[PDB]
Structure formats: structure tokens, C-alpha cells
Structure 1
Amino acid sequence: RGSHMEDFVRQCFNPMIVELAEKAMKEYGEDPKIETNKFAAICTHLEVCFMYSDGGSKHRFEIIEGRDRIMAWTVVNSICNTTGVEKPKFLPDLYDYKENRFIEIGVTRREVHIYYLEKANKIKSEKTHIHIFSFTGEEMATKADYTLDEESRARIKTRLFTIRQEMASRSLWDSFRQS
């Protein structure tokens, strides 16, 4: 059922991200043509994770996000069994080899701390790091430790505001912000 949002997603994000988002949705059996705001949110989340992992040095991060679920857990078990970090309850997005911790990255259309507290209580993990970005240029991270240098986080924030403008320009921001 032809939606403006679905075709917007396909210009905004590169094909590699679109294909991972589609696979993620149908691995858990949802339809990107129908659940189009969730389509847009998953592509957004994917892109931020990849931008984030590009912010470090060459070998800094293990990318968990974007793998099929069974392989992602395999890699997580490899990380826990070779480093001794406690196995997380939910699939994190990255592993930081420099700081020795998993990272859960989130993107929100609300005040970053509302979403942070939600992610904090969901993860019983005392140790996995949380880093939240908003669509208005705010961020929030565990212990005020933002992992990356300012430039790498700044370009993530710029991209998120561009996505917001592109949606608003198409009168999709309101549906998206209210979903």
C-alpha cells in the first residue's frame, strides 16, 4: 500500500542500510510497506551505529548491530568468553575494545533522558554503556562518558537533524514524531 514514507526512506539512506532494515523487520515478521515509521526508525538506528563505529580508531569497535541474530549472539559470546565481561541480557549495538564494554545506542524524538531511563531499566546490565542521541542535537551517555571525540558525535547530530528536516519538508515528521 503505497506510502510516501517508504519511498522517502529509500532516498535518505543508502541501499546497504535499507536492506539491513528490511531484513531486520522481516526476521521478526513486520512489513516495511505497512509499518513505515518503524522502517524509518530502524534505518536511522542502523546509520548512527555505523557512523559511531567509524568515529574510533581502526580496531576499536566490534559491530554487533546489523548482523543476523544468531551470529550477533555468537560474536557476543566470543567477546564475553575472551574478555570476561558479563553477558548482556539484550543484544547491544557495539563492543568497545578500548574501554572494554558493550554499547547500546539509541535515537529518540523525546527528551534524551526519558529514553535513557527507559533503556537503563530495560537492561539489567550494570556494565553495558548507554549513549542516546536526539533529533534536536542533544545526547546523553552513561557516567557522562561520550566515548568518541566531539567531532564524531557532532556529525552524527548534524545528520540526525538533516533527516528531521527532510521528513518535515515532506510532512512526514509529524506522523514520525507521533508514532
Structure 2
Amino acid sequence: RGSHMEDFVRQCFNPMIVELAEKAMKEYGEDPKIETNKFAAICTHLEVCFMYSDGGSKHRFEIIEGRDRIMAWTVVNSICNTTGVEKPKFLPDLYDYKENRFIEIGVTRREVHIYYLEKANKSEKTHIHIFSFTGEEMATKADYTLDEESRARIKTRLFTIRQEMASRSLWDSFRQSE
């Protein structure tokens, strides 16, 4: 059963993002051919995590998202046992070597405030940064980490994904899926 959303994902995101999203869904026991909206969301989150890590200086961020669970956790302990930060309960997405904190990246299609709150309850010390498909963002203590231009490019890319879906009439199904 092959959907339009699946072919759009593979044409919209680069093959390394796609393959990484596929590996993650197989690990949760989910199928990219069926839960195709979640497939698209995971790719999007992945690309945002990678654009974010590219926004700073050369080796400012450690990328924790996109690894297998065991290795991601191994890099968390090394960071913790080197910096003195406490171990998060849940796997974060990045580590900021400059500000010395873990970052949880969020990408939501609903209002930014609602999603921020839910993500907080699911780690007090981990910094949180949410991006919307409409162009909004909210970060912990109003500290947005990156400069304006790096965040702006992420928001542009998110709004382009939104248009590409709507042009194909997959947006509304994608928006009401979350």
C-alpha cells in the first residue's frame, strides 16, 4: 500500500535523512509505508536538528539525535562525566558545548505554547527549543541559542515543507494528524 505522502517524503528530504527516519521508526515498531504522516514528521525533526547543529561555530554542538539508542546514551554519559551536567531522564537531541546544556528540539503543527508545556513535563536542566510550521518559536528562559539568521533559515525551510504538502493536498491530513 503505497501513499502519495510516502513518495513526497522521499522526494522532499535527502536520502540520509530518509534512511535515518526509517531506522528510527523500525526501532519503535512502526512502518513508514503506513504511518506516513509520522514518517514525514520524523524526517522534518531530523533535518531541523541537523540545521540547528550547523548554525553555530565549528564543533559547538554534539549531535545526539540520529544515532542508535545505545550509542546516543553512551555519548550522553561521556558528556555528563566530562562536564558535570546531570544525566537527563530522556534522550535529548543535541548538546551545546558553548552554553554547556542539552537541547530538546521540538517541531509542532499546533500552537507553540501548548507543545512547549507538554514537552517540559516529559527533565528540569535540559534546554527546550520549539519551532512551528507557521514560523513561531519558543525557547527556555527566552534564550534562543543561535543567532537570528540561523533560526530564520530553519523557519523558512519549515514553511516551504508546509507549502509543498499543501500544493499536493497533504497538508490538512498532516496537520490534523498531530
Same fold flag (TM > 0.5) = yes
Secondary structure in 2 aligned to 1:120? helix
Deviation digits for residues 50-76 of structure 1 (CA, Å, limit 9, x no counterpart) = 000000100100000000100000000
Deviation digits for residues 99-138 of structure 1 (CA, Å, limit 9, x no counterpart) = 00000000000111100000011xx621110000000000
Secondary structure in 2 aligned to 1:133? strand
What is residue 163 of structure 2 aligned with on the other side? 165
Secondary structure in 2 aligned to 1:132? strand
Map residues 52-131 of structure 1 onto 2, 5 A cutoff. 52-121=52-121, 125-131=123-129
| CA drift at 1:28 | 1.4
Q: Give the distance between the partners of 1:84 and 1:7, measured in 2 at CA.
A: 45
Secondary structure in 2 aligned to 1:140? strand
Q: Give the distance between the partners of 2:124 and 2:13, measured in 1 at CA.
A: 34
Q: Give the distance between the partners of 2:137 and 2:66, measured in 1 at CA.
A: 22
Deviation digits for residues 68-107 of structure 1 (CA, Å, limit 9, x no counterpart) = 1000000001111111101001110000000000000000
Secondary structure in 2 aligned to 1:152? helix
Q: Give the distance between the partners of 1:167 and 1:139, measured in 2 at CA.
A: 21
Secondary structure in 1 aligned to 2:102? strand
Residue correspondences, number: 177
Q: Give the distance between the partners of 1:135 and 1:39, measured in 2 at CA.
A: 16
TM-score (norm 2): 0.98
Q: Give the distance between the partners of 2:123 and 2:3, measured in 1 at CA.
A: 39
Q: Give the distance between the partners of 2:116 and 2:91, measured in 1 at CA.
A: 16
Task: Extract structure 1 runs of 4+ deviating beyond 4 A.
Answer: none
| CA drift at 1:27 | 1.2
Secondary structure in 1 aligned to 2:160? helix
Q: Give the root-mean-square deviation of aligned CA atoms.
A: 0.7
Secondary structure in 2 aligned to 1:99? coil
Secondary structure in 2 aligned to 1:79? helix
Structure 1 residue runs of 5 or longer lacking an equivalent are none
Structure 2 residue runs of 5 or longer lacking an equivalent are none
Q: Give the distance between the partners of 2:95 and 2:74, measured in 1 at CA.
A: 13
- % identical equivalent positions: 100
Q: Give the distance between the partners of 2:27 and 2:142, measured in 1 at CA.
A: 35
Q: Give the distance between the partners of 2:128 and 2:113, measured in 1 at CA.
A: 11
| CA drift at 1:2 | 1.0
Secondary structure in 1 aligned to 2:130? strand
What is residue 33 of structure 1 aligned with on the other side? 33
What is residue 136 of structure 2 aligned with on the other side? 138
| CA drift at 1:29 | 1.3
